[PDB]
Structure formats: structure tokens, C-alpha cells
User: Fold this.
Amino acid sequence: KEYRTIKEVVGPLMAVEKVSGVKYEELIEVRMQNGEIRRGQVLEVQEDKAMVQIFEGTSGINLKNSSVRFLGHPLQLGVSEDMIGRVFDGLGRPKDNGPEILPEKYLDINGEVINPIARDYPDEFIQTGISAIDHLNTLVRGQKLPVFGPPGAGKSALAAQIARQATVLDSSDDFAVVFAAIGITFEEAEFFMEDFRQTGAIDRSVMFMNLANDPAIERIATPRMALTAAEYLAYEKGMHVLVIMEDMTNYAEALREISAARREVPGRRGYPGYLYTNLATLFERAGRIRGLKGSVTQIPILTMPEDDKTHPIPDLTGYITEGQIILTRELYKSGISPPIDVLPSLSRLKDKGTGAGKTREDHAATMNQLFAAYAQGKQAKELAVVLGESALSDIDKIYAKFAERFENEYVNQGFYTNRTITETLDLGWELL
Amino acid sequence: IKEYRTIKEVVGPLMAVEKVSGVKYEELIEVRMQNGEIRRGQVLEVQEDKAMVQIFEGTSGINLKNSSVRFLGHPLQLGVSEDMIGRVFDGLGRPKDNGPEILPEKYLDINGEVINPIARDYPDEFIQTGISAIDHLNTLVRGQKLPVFGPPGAGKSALAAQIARQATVLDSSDDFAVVFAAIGITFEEAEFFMEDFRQTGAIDRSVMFMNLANDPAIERIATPRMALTAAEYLAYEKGMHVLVIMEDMTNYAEALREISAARREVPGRRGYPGYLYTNLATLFERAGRIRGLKGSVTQIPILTMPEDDKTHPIPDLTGYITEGQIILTRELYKSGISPPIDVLPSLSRLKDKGTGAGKTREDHAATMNQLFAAYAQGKQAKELAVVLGESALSDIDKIYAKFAERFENEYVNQGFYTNRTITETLDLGWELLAMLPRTELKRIKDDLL
Amino acid sequence: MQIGKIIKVSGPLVMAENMSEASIQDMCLVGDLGVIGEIIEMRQDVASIQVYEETSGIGPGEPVRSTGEALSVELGPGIISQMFDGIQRPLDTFMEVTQSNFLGRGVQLPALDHEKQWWFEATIEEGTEVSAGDIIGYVDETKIIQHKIMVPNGIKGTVQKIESGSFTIDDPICVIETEQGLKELTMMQKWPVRRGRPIKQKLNPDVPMITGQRVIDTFFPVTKGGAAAVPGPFGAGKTVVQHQIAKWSDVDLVVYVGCGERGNEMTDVVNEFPELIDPNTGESLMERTVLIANTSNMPVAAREASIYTGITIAEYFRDMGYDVAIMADSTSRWAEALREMSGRLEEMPGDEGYPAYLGSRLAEYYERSGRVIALGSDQREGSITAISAVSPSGGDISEPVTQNTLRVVKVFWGLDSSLAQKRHFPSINWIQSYSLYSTEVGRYMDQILQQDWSDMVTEGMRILQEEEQLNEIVRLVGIDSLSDNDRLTLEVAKSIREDYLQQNAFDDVDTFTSREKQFNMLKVILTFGKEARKALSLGAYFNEIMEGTVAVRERISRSKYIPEEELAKISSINEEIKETIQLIVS
Assistant:
């Protein structure tokens, strides 16, 4: 039943009267007086009145001669195995002009919370082919390992590279990739999409593309769309799914904007104050489930502040994540691709992902003292800029040169070279 | 007996009662809960036939329909009697020892009265704290307020207990009482204070108001006022000199923040109530003497020094109000230094009215100034003596540092149970400038005698 | 009985009319789904409820039922060895009853098994006058722990009917003649978790707890009824220290509380803790442990109520005469939950966004631990000892959670990553750690050992603190520039560090060191120091002392591994120490 009872429009918000049976977070359709149809969501419901928000805004609407239909369900994803190779927008609607998907079922994109005793501990090793990660900051299935970087420092290039050369060692059980673009530009999106098509990786990928000029309210739905598809492929088809989301900083900003538009109570830095709730509800959606085959692994991509806080505070993210992968600008100016500063980078779960029966057995030991060559390699030369010519030169003579090699060849793989882990270890020993 | 069954509304710790009359601002209330439980509260606002109250113990479990509010017809008051001496109470003056409830002389508004400016008399007599670093250099005067600033756990509580143990008025026909206010301290710290009071019998000249860390915050706010109302009663109506020790006033500021946020009252300038200073003045101004009366009220607030952090009860903020400082450091306390009072930043602006003949020997001032100066630079000598090395040690500068090291180890480290009378500390101060030849002595007139 | 009706749903806030029979802070089942919520406000008959689960799909017109009680725990046989969430939802039962790996909205399951038969053994006679705390009988609930059945608070009178037998916790096992008539008692009582369970008297915790971990028992001990704070940085072996305390402490029950932790971390806990073996019996520790587990994405009220649920259970077992250790990890996460709940309620922030009552809340929780005389005519003693993890985002003790904790607890065990690098475990910083119980514990240790152990401890600590200063002299000038006494101090300090402080939790013998073994080990260390000092002043050189002492010094370093039955082999070291050095002075 359409309701012809719109009484108030203030900004993107609408007040509808004399409804009954309307539920919180229920989706609506506005049928405008000119025949246009917009999609929306119930944000408050009170006696016989409902307050909704229109995804496309309210510009052009005439209240008296428009109507609202209450669809009787929230934001859902139509899921199917056929989502592999396809490209959608932030709401799961096709962006690739391709054949239509007949969903197996529709799933609430908010998800369920895993019972803690049903969860399984992260175990297997993922070969990103990036030596700087695979060796020092090893990625395990079920982990949440974010990467932080300044703008245009190739962090997105790194993202597409991990998406490219990510695999498991048995590789009997397929590795699917779910990619979520969160409020990025058309050109960034095209980088990801056309790369995915040229390397063929699209054949094992599902893409959710929300652009910098899409409605912020849809930007809020995008990561949950990605993760619902990911959990469906993992726990209902037995797949091992890797989830990449850039840029989560944009997700933080869209949250701030929506909360402002809804005259809510501002928390820290005007950010909604439920950033921990929201980001944790997103990031804790990774892992393994005892008794099921698949897995979900997340790699969020964040813009690092490099300024007066006023960013999606990492401490929040790092408080929920199991590690940090840091890119700095000074490695990008040197031409180092990928520019990972191994020193503040951490993998909270590298331990039981790497070991005997999982990787070559030098791996650990060389890691646990390969940091040390870089630790005292730049402890001399970078610190002693003033005293550089002679202070600590006769002794510790080579500890600079080997650090230069660590940057120049060990970590400067190139954004298009796939280093097998054992190959990486060979380079690691030759550098020593 | 005014009691209504008309609770309309409960939001957090606040309640609205309607269809009332004769209810006054800040009047005390009791909530009679449907389950027999009884909670205390205060009228925060009153308008037409409505009254907004706040419940000290909160509103958890209250059923509005079946509960009632009794309006007691008076504010927070303390029933006073000289029989408070020797007893132990909670923050609201209720007996905490298993003795009897007292029959009050009268009930006093714990906010107190505002002294007429021409009726106040200046502080002018001496008090024996027994801690020489105080009694000598930073003398405490009857009627003064001298705070103690300190680091966490660094014998600060031991100093509180020591002053309360060893406090009296010399050569005086008048009585000396102590009122002790614990503000939001733990059970173990309170047990320390209570039975230390009874091992030394100090309890017998003492009144104790014990507020614990898990008591309601309003009771923290009320505790020092209860203490001071008792103290003023004893002083200005029983003629005694009363020393009032309030341990962890920093906890008091945190309780003020909590109350303000619960009341959505003051947008906190620092999250902190804007009136933290003003409230504190309301307490600190309750010390002094009244001309025409032989009593006296003297205050020693004890605070946790901000651990080099900005958001705290700032010392300088207190510093306008207070009439000095007594600062303790752990850098000295880890050296076994106890009581660890760093004598350089300590100050007692009212010392002259206490450092007087007839209460002290005449050497007091001059002693103090050369002990101070010669330690003052003896330190600098020793600091430079290690940073410049044992090789770069001058003679005059080998002897300046000696005084400093010995001053710490023996002039300040007297121990927490040694009551050094003023006569001692004068002699004992000279005993160590006995190394200092006659050559740098502030006076020369009666260095002999 | 009374069904209220939803009139407003807005995010987590739900307003329901026709609720006048409910009370503030009552728990409610909200909507057709029956999701759990709490009454926070009441205006005439209209209640405002903060809903714990997702409110999506809920709207006006639906029902609301009050449970008639505040957030509570069920206490009775069947609680030991269970894994709960922060509001005592049974996680194992949830999986089988719902046939799902997820916590779905609005499923309602009792915390304990109400169908299970237990053997109640009656131990009180009919006609007896009883009040709260009195033990009427018991149940052998696990292979380790005897569940004592007590008269609930609020019940007083004469035992009229009582017989042993096989009952569920729902069956009336006792009848008591009260001023209000006959009241039936079952084996289960309920208690509201934000209220401390009443006691007869609070006592000073002055009896040392034997953890068997040498650094703690000796230099930073905790008493039964005390509380300790543990910084838990990454890669510092916190989990192994925690297991060590849990299985080796001379307590009766362990209550572990995971407050809103990362899913994978919490999976570690739920997997490893059951594999822990109880030393005395060889059974799993779960036969005397209650575990609460919450992840970051669980309802905030579960994560905020985690510690209160845990400590209410702990108080319940303390009232039985038992000693309990409640371990909370992490209280920083619990404080995150507090902060979020404060933000939802539109409250005015305090320091760093935390509510103004953060300190007060922490104080209520920690003042609920301690040693007590419990209720009951026998006046038995119980204690709760608290071990609380803090984990700041930057890892700092100036941040509000840690500063407020250290305001009210007396023990601090500073775990250190640099110590874990050097393979020094447990990585407890001996310079920054402290225990304000150490004086009182020294008194106790002296009276119990009939040795002068307090002085030995003070001297060992003087040696370690002196080593820290001599190490900087070694930094600025060379090692060769030290006195033979100074060099000896460094060597005896190395012996304290490597032969005493360093403990392998995985070695069968090093994993636990008794009180007596600890005494003999430390006096071996210190007597080497002492006799070598004497021989130094007697003309011998430190190099002659060292080169001539290799073998007995290796017997010193190996003493940690001597079996507890062969303790003389440690004490005899003293003789060998005195003899060799005596022939070194010729």
C-alpha cells in the first residue's frame, strides 16, 4: 500500500503520517509526482508516524502529490555463486551491464555475531607475494590486517597487488576476492577495475564500487554489502575469501556526515562516537568457523592522518585489528615499490601462521634477526645526519649498505613482481 | 510528616514529584521504595506543584507507582555535640563505629555562615605539628590553610596520620581538637587511618568523617562540609583550636565533575565544573579566627600532585586560595627520605605570626634562611658535582654539597613516628651548620647564644 | 502479567507504554522477537528502554514484557565449568539449542541446566534456626569442587522439612518456617550483578597467596583479597603468566572474564583454558573455573556487565568459605564499553571521552573484592583476589583507566616487551613493579618460616636496584673500571635475575616453586654474595673468587630444577659455598 501522507521534508529527511506496521530500518520507495522513484530507509518510527531518509536526497519532490511505499524489509543482498566475475555498486545493483543475477536468497547486510565458542583460530599462511608482509608481518586466514598510507603513495597500487598475487599453498580450495571501493574517485575505481580485467583476477572476484560522489548513506552500506557476500561465499560455499576495502577513511567521513544530517549528538572530533561499534561490527566479521570449510580475511586500506588527528583514528582500528602495515612518503620518493616501513608494521598473528609444516623453517629466525640489520642500519645513518661522515663509520661499516639493499631490492620488489615466499627467503639470506 | 505518592518521572538519578506544596529548594528527601528500601535525596528544582529531586544512591529498582517521597523540611545538616570527640562517622555524619547515636545539641546547615569581614580576626598563634620541615621552615599558624601536595602512595597518608597524631598547642590553657575527613579513599586506607588513631589514642581528641571510594559522590561533596561544620562548632562555641585534615581533596574535585555531569548542570569548561575554584574557596574560607572568641579553625588539605599531566586539580588554581605549599616527591621518597618534603618549593606565607618568641626561639628566622640557602646551593653543587665529575670538585663546592646530602638524610628523614619538638629542630638545624664556619652565617649578633 | 506496547523505536532506544508495573533498570523482552533491553527511564506508565541487540525490524504496536528483575545471575549447581557471555548466556547450550554458530536475536535460554538431576546431600537438621549464608547441604558438582547450598538473603527461620535425594535445581529441597509462613528453597538463588552480595565484615587481606611464581611471591606478592594490575603489552607472555597464576595459585575457584576482546584473541582463551590441567588432581581447570567470554561485536551491555557478572559469581563462591581469583582481561575494553554506553545515553564526557563516573565504577568493582567474614552462624572466611589486565592503545599508565585502577589497587606487575626480547620470562619489570602488601607479607613470611625472610627480600631488591645504577656506570665508562665489590654486585645481581627471577612455565619443575624451595634458593643466592664479599675484604680478588667458584655457581643456577622432595640438595649448596671460598682465601 502506497501512503499519500508525506507531511514534512527537511533536508534529506521525510516525515510520513498515518502509517501502521512500519519497522525500524525498513526500506521505502518514494514515488514522486513526476514518476521518478527513489529508495530510502526508515530511521525513526513513532506511533502512526515514520521518519525516513531518501538515498537520492529530496530535491524536486512535491509532498502533496508524492507517495511512499514501505517494502517490508531492510537493506539486503541477493546472493548467488554467480556473483563471481561481476561488478556491482555500493548497493549490490549491477554496474557492469552484465546478465542479471537470480538470487538464491536475500540476506540482511548487518549480519550475525559468531558465537565465540564456535569460532576457529587463524592458522593458515597467505602468500601475498609481498616479501615485506609475508616474512616480517605475515598474513593468516581469518586475520584482519589493515594498511595505512598517505594519498598517492601507491597504497592503492599495493591493494591491487595483494588482490592480484594472493594465494594459499595447497590452492586446491579456491581463493575468492571481494573488493569494496568506499567513496573513491572514478579514476581510482577504473584503476582497480581495468587492472582486474587485464590480469584476469576478475575471474575470482566480486566488486562493490561506491564512488566519491555517491550518496554518503550508500557509502555506509557498501562495506556491509561486501562482507555479506564474503561470508556467503565463505561459510555457504566453503571458499577462502580475501576482502579489500579502500578507503575506510572515507567510510569514517560518511559516518560523520550522516550523523550530522540526523541532528545526533556528536562524539569525538564530531565523529558519531559509535565509530568503535561500527568499525568493530565490520572488522570482527572475519575469521574461521569450527566445522565449516571456508574463511574470511580482511585487509582494510586507510588514509594515514599525517596531520592534527582529524582522521579515522587508527587506534580504534588497530584496537580491533590484529596488526598494522605502514606506508610512508619517504619510501615512495626513493622509488621504493611497495613502500612498507617494516619497523612500525606489526602482524599480531604471525606466530601460528608461520612455522614448521606451514613455511620454510629459516623463515622465523631470519625474520627475528632481519629486523635487526635494519634496526641498527638506520640507527647510524638516519639518526646521525650531522655526524654522518665519520661517526660510527670505521665500525658498523656495512650496516648502512645492507639497509640500503633492504630498501632498494628486498622491499622494492615492484608493484608487479610476485615473490614466492621461498624465493623471498633466498633473497633474505643473500642480503645477509 | 510530609509524604507524597506522586512520583511522575524518573530519568537517571533524578525524579519528578507532582502535586506537592510547601517544598523548598535544596530540601532533603527520602524515597520510600516499594520494597522497603530507603534512599536519601535533595531537591534540585521546585516549580509550581512539582519538585525535581536527585537520589544519592540512584534510582535503580524504583517502581514509580508504588514508591513515595518524604520531604524532611530541612537541608543537609549535622547534629552537633561535644560528644563527637572520640567517635567515627561516615561522610553524612552517621555513626561508623558500633557505639550509640548521639543526641545533638542543635542541627547546623553544613554550608555554614559567611563571616562579616570586620568580625574576622587574623591568624596569630603557633601550632606544633612535630614534623620539623614544617614546624621550622614552613610554620603552620592557628587559623591558616596550608595544603600538602604529594605523589601517589609516597608516605602522604603516613604524613597525614603523623600530623594528626602529633598536633597540639604549646603553653595554652585552651583545648586542641582534630577533625579528620577522608574523601573517597579505599577500605584499606580507611582501616589504616582508623586503627592507627586507636593504637596511639589520637582518636580520643579526634572526630573522623570517613568517605570511601565506592560511596555516593554527593557524600564526597558533603564530607568536608560535615567536617568543617563540626570543626566550627567545636572552635567558635566550645573555644577549642581545631585542626582539620582532609585527605585526597583531588577525589573531591572528581566527585564535583561527576555531580555536574549527572546533573547536566555546567557545560564543563574542562569537563570540570567551572566552580571548582569557587566551591573550593567556599571550603577554604571556612578557616581562621573570629575576634572576641578564643577558638580557631585550621585546615590542611592533602592532594595528589598532578603526575606531570595537564588535566588535574591544578596546583596554582589552588595556589591563589591556599596560603602556602608543602610538596612531597618520590624522587626523595625512593631515597628512604620520609617525610619526603622537598624543602625548596615549600612555602608558608603566614609563618611570621608563628615564628615568634613566646612560641619559638629567636633563631627561627635566621636559622631558616641559612639552612634554606646553604641547602639551596648545596644541591646545585652536588648535581654539578656528578655531571662535572668527581675530578671537577671545588673546595667551597665540596663543602656546600655535604650540607645538602646530610640535610636530606638527617634533617628531613626523621621518620613517620618521631615527634621532634620545636626546641629540638632548632638545635638540630644548627648542629649541621656547625660544619659551616662562622663565615657564612646570616647574623653575627647571637651566634654564641 | 502486564504486556506493554511499543510506541517508539529509534535506533537502540525503544519507548513502550503500559509499563507501570515495571521498575527502573528492569530487564525486558522487547518486540515480537523478544530482544533483551533495560528500562532506563519512566514517565508515568511510559518506559524508555535501551535495547542490547539490533532493533531492525521492530516497530510500534509490538509487545514488551518485563522480566520483573534487574540484570541478574542464576547461582546453583551447573554453573561451574560453563562458558558464559557477559550476561550469563550459556554459549554451549546456545549452539545446540539453536543449531547455529551465531548469536541470534531474542533467543532466551536459562543460564543453568534446569532439567539435570543432582544428588543433594543434606547436612542440617530439621528444627534448626537459620539465616542468610547458613549451609543446609551440598552437591558434589565437579570432581574438584563441592557446591555448598546456603540460605538465600532475605530468608530467616526454622528448618521444617529437609531430606537428601536427587533433585533438579527447580525442585523444593527445603522448607523454612519464617515470620511470613512456609517458604520453599531450591538449589538455585538469583542475584542482581550490579549489587555486591552482603557480608558480615570486611577484613584486611594480609595472608600471602602462593602463586609459585618466584618473582611475584617474593618481590611483588598479592594477598588473598588483594588486587593486581597487569599492563599486558604485545609479545610479553601475558597469557602464560595468566595461565600460571590460574592453575598454580592456592585458590579454590577461578573466574575468568573476557571483556569485549578481539574474536581471534578470545578464541585463543576459549581453546587454551580448557586444556589447562589442574595440578593437584590432573583434571581440567574447568572443573573449578567459571569463564565469561565476549567479543568486540557483542552487545555493549554484555561487555560492560562482564566484570559485574563475573564478580557476582565470585562473591557467591566466596560466601561459601572459598578463596576465589577473578581475572579480568581486558578492563580497558570494559571501559570502552562504558564509554560507548555513555555516548548512547547522551551524557557529558569526562577525561578522554570516558564518562565522569569511570573512577567510581572501577572503585565499586574493586571494592567488591577482598577478604570477608561471610554471613552465617559459623562466620566462615572467604576472599576474592582480583587480577586485572589493562591494555591502553598507546600502552601508558597516565591514561584514565590505568590511573584510576592504580588509585584503588595495591599491586602492579609491569610486563615488558624489552624483557621478552632478552628471553627473560616472566617479563615482569623488577624496577617498575611494586606491591604495597610486601611489608605485611614480610611479617607473615617471617612468622610462618621462622626465618628472617623480609630482610633477605629487601637485600635482593637492594642488589637489583644497585645493578641498575652500576649498569649506567658501565655504560659511561668501561666494565674494567669497576671495584671488585662493584663487579661482585653485578654478578650476584645476574644470579638473582637468571637463577631466581627467570622461570620456565613449561618445565615440569621450574613451572612452580614452593615457599620453602623459594627460601632455600634465595638464601643460596645471597650466601654466595655474602661469603664472596667476606673473601673480597680478606685479600682475595674477584677474579680468583669467580674462577674458583664455577662448579658451585653452576649448582646455584641449576637449583631451580631440584625436585621438591630433594630440597636438601639446595640447602647443602650453602655448605659447598662456604667451603670452596674458605679454601680460596687459603
